[PDB]
Design a protein around this nucleic acid. Structure first.
Lengths: 50, 50, 219, 182
RNA sequence: UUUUUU
């Protein structure tokens, strides 16, 4: 029923619900820290010569 | 819509002036916002695809 | 001599009576007490006595000018500056001295509500919002409708319905009888999604003051 | 005026979860909130007073108490506030048999309380609809036009999330809820 | 050898 009620709607995808579930909370808790660390550490690699 | 006018302080109806609607061409079965037309009619509370 | 006391008593009797005595009290005080700040009290009394009927473009207006030059430190000359800037005489400095007289002497809504209303009538708006926020922290339980209503409408001009509805709810909780607030709150709900709460609110707005056509039409 | 005009114009110019202290803070419950939306025949306890103090500002409490008779004071102050604001409130109970006497007591305590379950549909237009969570989950997937008027959603016994066959319902509901619903 | 909802 969940899969059907989300494939039916166009702007919602099923992985959104999977992302927001409580059993994914520990992994997804500090997510903003993960993307900020990635986007500002990719800069730090942007330093080294080829 | 022929919307009303309001005195800038202690708003009172000066007159009715026509303006352009902005949230038309929006529907209950193709839009997920709290601006869409109410619904088809008095209808079953739950169990409604589309 | 009772110089200040006798003059003040005569001015009070003039206030109790018509402005006939006021002309004598004003002339006697101005001739006797030659000053700027102590004279400013007699100048304000003469302007308050003359404002009833006298035009007083030079008798009280120059007296109010001397009282404005005698602007006291604490809660003694702000209301005079507000009343001096009533309708004319460089209305932009009139807005400036409403801002100053309410910024210094912010005491009661009466002066406060008029002050904020005249401030927001001029073009600048992003200063009124700060004023409204400041009054909002000191709202204890209701009793600040003069602020709530203005800030709710100000929030209603923008598309920020949650705070606007909350503000109007607080205003009605203060005093749930002004039909204007009920109508505006109903319109706030109708602007966003809600349909049966706008209906209920508009019906309540029309039930009292059943003269209003807009409410019944909206229903 | 030229000199007087100038002489006047120169003078004219993150944590996300706040553990509110259980016992210490509240001392003054009646100086503010002088017109409570509901009046009892006794005194509300300390933690219920703090919960009401935060329900006034339209916050989102998580009550976790011992006695079953202490929570329903909050659960009916929220409905008194909802009836005061003209908005609507949904009280949701998991057990089909629990949402009958709660209905009786809420209709007896004040005004209109509709009931919705698998078979009963008494007055589906009132302002205190009582439902089972699978019906709120079913009318969240469609619009159902009741969500347009809500203020509060009173999840009653939220410790059924640990169930093995119904714990997913509480999380589908807690995810699909729009933002304007406390 | 108990309990439960569209």
């Amino acid at each position: 029923t969940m899969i059907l009620n989300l494939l039916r709607v166009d702007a919602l995808r099923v992985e959104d619900m999977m992302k927001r579930s409580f059993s994914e909370f520990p992994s997804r808790k500090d997510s903003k820290a993960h993307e900020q660390a990635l986007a500002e550490l990719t800069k730090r690699l942007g330093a080294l010569e080829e | 819509d022929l919307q009303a006018q309001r005195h800038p302080t202690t708003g009172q109806i000066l007159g009715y002036k026509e303006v352009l609607l902005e949230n038309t061409n929006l529907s209950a079965t193709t839009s997920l916002s709290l601006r869409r037309p109410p619904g088809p009619a008095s209808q079953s509370l739950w169990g409604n695809p589309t | 001599a009772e110089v200040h006391a006798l003059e003040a008593l005569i001015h009070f009797t003039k206030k109790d009576y018509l402005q006939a005595e006021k002309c004598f009290q004003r002339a006697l005080e101005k001739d006797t007490e030659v000053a700027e700040y102590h004279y400013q009290l007699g100048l304000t009394y003469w302007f308050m006595g003359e404002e009833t009927r006298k035009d007083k473009t030079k008798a009280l207006t120059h007296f109010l000018k001397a009282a404005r030059l005698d602007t006291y430190m604490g809660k003694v000359f702000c209301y005079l500056g507000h009343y001096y800037r009533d309708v004319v005489g460089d209305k932009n400095r009139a807005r400036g001295c409403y801002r100053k007289a309410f910024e210094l002497d912010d005491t009661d809504a009466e002066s406060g509500a008029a002050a904020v209303d005249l401030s927001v009538e001029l073009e600048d708006m992003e200063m009124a919002l700060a004023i409204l926020t400041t009054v909002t922290q000191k709202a204890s339980a209701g009793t600040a409708k003069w602020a709530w209503l203005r800030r709710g409408l100000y929030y209603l001009k923008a598309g920020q319905h949650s705070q606007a509805v909350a503000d109007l709810q607080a205003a009605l909780r203060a005093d749930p009888k002004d039909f204007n607030c009920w109508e505006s709150l109903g319109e706030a709900y109708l602007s966003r999604g809600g349909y049966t709460t706008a209906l209920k609110s508009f019906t309540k707005a029309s039930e009292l003051n059943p003269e209003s056509i807009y409410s019944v039409f909206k229903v | 005026l030229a000199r007087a005009s100038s002489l006047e114009d120169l003078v004219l110019k993150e944590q996300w979860a706040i553990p509110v202290d259980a016992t210490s803070p509240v001392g003054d419950f009646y100086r503010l909130i002088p017109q409570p939306a509901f009046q009892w025949a006794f005194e509300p306890d300390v933690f219920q007073k703090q919960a009401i103090l935060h329900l006034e500002r339209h916050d989102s409490v998580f009550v976790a108490a011992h006695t079953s008779a202490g929570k329903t004071v909050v659960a009916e102050y929220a409905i008194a506030l909802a009836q005061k604001h003209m908005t609507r409130t949904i009280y949701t109970s998991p057990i089909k048999a629990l949402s009958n006497q709660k209905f009786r007591d809420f209709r007896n305590t004040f005004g209109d309380v509709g009931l919705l379950t698998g078979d009963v549909q008494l007055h589906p237009e009132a302002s205190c609809l009582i439902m089972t969570t699978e019906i709120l989950r079913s009318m969240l997937y469609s619009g159902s036009d009741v969500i347009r008027d809500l203020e509060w959603v009173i999840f009653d016994e939220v410790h059924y999330i640990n169930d093995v066959e119904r714990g997913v319902v509480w999380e589908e509901v807690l995810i699909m809820l729009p933002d304007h619903v406390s």
